[PDB]
Design a protein around this motif. Structure first.
Motif, PDB file in Angstrom:
ATOM      1  N   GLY A 109       4.394 -43.573 -54.981  1.00 33.60           N
ATOM      2  CA  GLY A 109       4.481 -43.491 -56.145  1.00 33.60           C
ATOM      3  C   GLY A 109       2.850 -43.440 -56.691  1.00 33.60           C
ATOM      4  N   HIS A 110       2.736 -43.877 -58.097  1.00 33.07           N
ATOM      5  CA  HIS A 110       1.341 -43.794 -58.612  1.00 33.07           C
ATOM      6  C   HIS A 110       1.472 -44.576 -59.845  1.00 33.07           C
ATOM      7  N   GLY A 111       0.386 -45.212 -60.389  1.00 25.87           N
ATOM      8  CA  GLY A 111       0.200 -45.994 -61.488  1.00 25.87           C
ATOM      9  C   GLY A 111      -0.531 -45.529 -62.712  1.00 25.87           C
ATOM     10  N   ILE A 112      -0.093 -45.837 -64.105  1.00 33.12           N
ATOM     11  CA  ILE A 112      -0.647 -45.393 -64.934  1.00 33.12           C
ATOM     12  C   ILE A 112      -1.449 -46.650 -65.730  1.00 33.12           C
ATOM     13  N   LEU A 113      -2.606 -46.792 -66.159  1.00 32.41           N
ATOM     14  CA  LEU A 113      -3.108 -47.930 -66.834  1.00 32.41           C
ATOM     15  C   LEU A 113      -3.266 -47.223 -68.130  1.00 32.41           C
ATOM     16  N   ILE A 162      -5.141 -43.620 -67.626  1.00 35.91           N
ATOM     17  CA  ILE A 162      -5.776 -43.712 -66.391  1.00 35.91           C
ATOM     18  C   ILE A 162      -4.661 -43.792 -65.048  1.00 35.91           C
ATOM     19  N   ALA A 163      -4.696 -42.623 -64.343  1.00 37.94           N
ATOM     20  CA  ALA A 163      -4.102 -42.885 -63.286  1.00 37.94           C
ATOM     21  C   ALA A 163      -4.658 -43.286 -61.989  1.00 37.94           C
ATOM     22  N   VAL A 164      -4.024 -44.074 -61.409  1.00 39.69           N
ATOM     23  CA  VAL A 164      -4.245 -44.934 -60.004  1.00 39.69           C
ATOM     24  C   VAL A 164      -3.318 -44.497 -58.974  1.00 39.69           C
ATOM     25  N   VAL A 165      -4.249 -44.203 -57.828  1.00 34.32           N
ATOM     26  CA  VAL A 165      -3.441 -43.661 -56.390  1.00 34.32           C
ATOM     27  C   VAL A 165      -4.099 -44.125 -55.428  1.00 34.32           C
ATOM     28  N   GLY A 166      -3.605 -44.356 -54.302  1.00 33.56           N
ATOM     29  CA  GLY A 166      -4.353 -44.419 -53.032  1.00 33.56           C
ATOM     30  C   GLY A 166      -3.655 -43.884 -51.715  1.00 33.56           C
ATOM     31  N   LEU A 179      -9.154 -42.823 -57.274  1.00 33.08           N
ATOM     32  CA  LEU A 179      -8.608 -42.694 -55.933  1.00 33.08           C
ATOM     33  C   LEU A 179      -9.110 -43.622 -54.905  1.00 33.08           C
ATOM     34  N   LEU A 180      -8.210 -44.593 -54.886  1.00 33.83           N
ATOM     35  CA  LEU A 180      -8.794 -45.742 -53.851  1.00 33.83           C
ATOM     36  C   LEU A 180      -8.842 -45.634 -52.396  1.00 33.83           C
TER      37      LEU A 180
END
Ligand SMILES: *[C@@H]1O[C@H](CO)[C@@H](O[C@@H]2O[C@H](CO)[C@@H](O)[C@H](O)[C@H]2NC(C)=O)[C@H](O)[C@H]1NC(C)=O
Ligand SMILES: *[C@@H]1O[C@H](CO)[C@@H](O)[C@H](O)[C@H]1NC(C)=O
Ligand SMILES: *[C@@H]1O[C@H](CO)[C@@H](O)[C@H](O)[C@H]1NC(C)=O
Ligand SMILES: *[C@@H]1O[C@H](CO)[C@@H](O)[C@H](O)[C@H]1NC(C)=O
Ligand SMILES: *[C@@H]1O[C@H](CO)[C@@H](O)[C@H](O)[C@H]1NC(C)=O
Ligand SMILES: *[C@@H]1O[C@H](CO)[C@@H](O)[C@H](O)[C@H]1NC(C)=O
Ligand SMILES: [Fe+3]
Ligand SMILES: [Fe+3]
Length: 504
Positions: free
Chosen positions: A463-467, A165-169, A194-195
């Motif tokens: 950057g971005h995160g991955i869960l 799951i990619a998480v970005v804002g 997308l937050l």
């Protein structure tokens, strides 16, 4: 294996410090690559359950300028043909169409109205399965899309999870954004969150002039906080390779307010994306919930009434009461504004939301919180009510997607950098809740004089995160900085371990 939260909190780390340029409207990736009523800006969104999903697109160019004439959404149909193979699109769904306008009743300001937006919900899908689809109006020659494909979320259960799951804002649409999205796409996420703070259309005047900071440039010389709505279309066009193949769930941030005629707000955000508002019974585009495998996600609204007496809070109480943690073991929330960020930017700005909602979420064993808003990366230690707590949620802020606004570099705990308390509350939502600490190392003060112990890691990088949820108790979190391009690069990595027998 990397570190994990089972070890307890880690000693805080600050990564030493090292604007972005918006994509021009001449960039081929943002130009209209179709003609007539052919679909553009195609995007997939999840429904509340894995067995249903949304397909959305726009047909027709927008209008920007003089006497805009909003389109009749009933003149172009909303059809999706789909199936388990690219050559057997034998299932059919129909949906709704709408337009939105961005109107300003001030001399000199230009008006906007959209192409026709379409939203179609696909029912009766198998979980964990690839579906091919084409969208558009089959009664209009050339008005059907190419065949695309996406994969539904896996079935809901304690051992069934999306791989990544990619998480970005706070993406915006700069060359740094393209780096964030390229990094993200190369990690092949099953789902993008997308937050808030999507296109940053409101860094532009209605005649297309942009700035890195509206309040610096135009706030005093314009009659309203203007927008250039075409940036949304450029954004939707640029993102289509991702959104047409990967479900993307959006929640609103402050740059989506986009106040216009009659005090109307959030017009673009509310119209453009599909949300499982009806399926999750929020009946709001601003907050909702959905299940992705054994994860129950709650998207909350930092910019809709979050008080204990309001509609959102009542909905959240009901939503949490329906969660069975033996079916969805993971309870994860996202909203725009961080509660535990330690940067000067927006320091304690959402304190009233924390005071309203934190105890409710803690009482239901919220595992992880993702936010944006702050243009930097931060991960908290497990924390509840500013206290390190083995049953508190991990708060992760990834508002570092790459928009053209300045990066958050100053920390509130930096010498002489503590902001005045009265200068912190969010103006749009109002209220004041951020009082000096009454216990702990910073007792008596509004800020610490060093990195707070509830902050595990903070770095001023895009950057971005991955869960990667592994099973009912372990999830691997990875945050990737944009400036690292080598294979396997990771800036921050930790196993988040939940202990349901301890905390529930
Ligand atoms: C859930 O997943 C975690 C992580 O994959 C499992 O913990 C790992 O188990 C393997 C095999 O014993 C070890 O080699 C790793 O070192 C472990 N990693 C960590 C961070 O502990 C865990 O056992 C799984 N739990 C269940 C119930 O299946
Ligand atoms: C924009 O729309 C508003 C509301 O219809 C109208 O009052 C205004 O005159 C319009 N401006 C232009 C340049 O058309
Ligand atoms: C943003 O992109 C530019 C050009 O690629 C690069 O030089 C700059 O370092 C990036 N900014 C950050 C904070 O990574
Ligand atoms: C837009 O209008 C502003 C003044 O309101 C001006 O400064 C700016 O240069 C103009 N931009 C374009 C693309 O015309
Ligand atoms: C959080 O800490 C403050 C100050 O000690 C306390 O007054 C408040 O009751 C606590 N909130 C909760 C939900 O426990
Ligand atoms: C709160 O802490 C700040 C310093 O961070 C201080 O200037 C201020 O006077 C304090 N206010 C109260 C009521 O203690
Ligand atoms: Fe932002
Ligand atoms: Fe924001």
């Amino acid at each position: 294996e990397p570190a994990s939260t089972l070890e307890g909190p880690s000693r805080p780390v600050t990564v030493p410090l090292r604007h972005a340029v918006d994509l021009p409207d001449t960039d081929p990736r943002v130009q209209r690559r179709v003609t007539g009523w052919a679909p553009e800006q195609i995007a997939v969104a999840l429904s509340a359950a894995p067995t249903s999903a949304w397909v959305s697109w726009i047909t027709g160019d927008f209008q920007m300028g003089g006497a805009v004439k909003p389109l009749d959404p009933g003149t172009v149909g909303s059809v999706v043909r789909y199936g388990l193979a690219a050559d057997s699109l034998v299932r059919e769904a129909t949906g709704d169409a709408l337009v939105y306008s961005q109107l300003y009743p001030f001399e000199g300001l230009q008006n906007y109205t959209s192409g026709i937006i379409h939203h179609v919900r696909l029912q009766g899908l198998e979980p964990g399965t690839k579906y091919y689809y084409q969208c558009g109006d089959p009664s209009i020659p050339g008005a059907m899309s190419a065949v695309h494909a996406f994969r539904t979320m896996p079935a809901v259960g304690p051992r069934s999870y999306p791989g990544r799951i990619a998480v970005v804002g706070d993406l915006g649409l700069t060359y740094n954004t393209t780096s964030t999205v390229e990094h993200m796409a190369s990690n092949q996420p099953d789902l993008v969150l997308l937050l808030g703070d999507v296109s940053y259309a409101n860094l532009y005047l209605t005649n297309g002039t942009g700035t890195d900071c509206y309040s610096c440039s135009f706030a005093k010389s314009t009659p309203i906080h203007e927008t250039y709505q075409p940036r949304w279309d450029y954004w939707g066009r640029y993102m289509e390779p991702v959104t047409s193949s990967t479900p993307m769930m959006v929640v609103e941030g402050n740059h989506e307010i986009e106040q216009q005629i009659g005090n109307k707000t959030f017009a673009a955000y509310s119209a453009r994306f599909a949300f499982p508002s009806m399926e999750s019974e929020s009946f709001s585009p601003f907050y909702y919930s959905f299940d992705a495998g054994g994860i129950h996600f709650i998207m909350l609204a930092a910019y809709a009434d979050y008080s204990k007496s309001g509609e959102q809070y009542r909905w959240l109480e009901k939503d949490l009461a329906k969660v069975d943690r033996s079916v969805t073991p993971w309870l994860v929330a996202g909203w725009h504004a961080p509660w535990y960020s330690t940067y000067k930017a927006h320091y304690r700005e959402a304190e009233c939301m924390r005071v309203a909602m934190e105890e409710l979420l803690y009482s239901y064993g919220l595992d992880i919180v993702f936010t944006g808003h702050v243009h930097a990366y931060e991960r908290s230690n497990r924390v509840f009510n500013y206290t390190l707590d083995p049953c508190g949620a991990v708060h992760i802020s990834v508002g570092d997607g790459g928009n053209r606004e300045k990066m958050a570099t100053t920390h509130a705990d930096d010498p002489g950098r503590c902001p005045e308390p009265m200068s912190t509350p969010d103006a749009f939502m109002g209220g004041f809740c951020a009082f000096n600490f009454t216990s702990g190392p910073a007792a008596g003060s509004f800020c610490w004089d060093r990195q707070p112990d509830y902050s595990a890691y903070r770095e001023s990088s895009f950057g971005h995160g991955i869960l990667e949820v592994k099973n009912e108790t372990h999830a691997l979190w990875k945050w990737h900085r944009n400036q690292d391009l080598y294979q396997g690069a990771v800036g921050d990595e930790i196993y988040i371990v939940r202990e349901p027998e301890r905390c529930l």
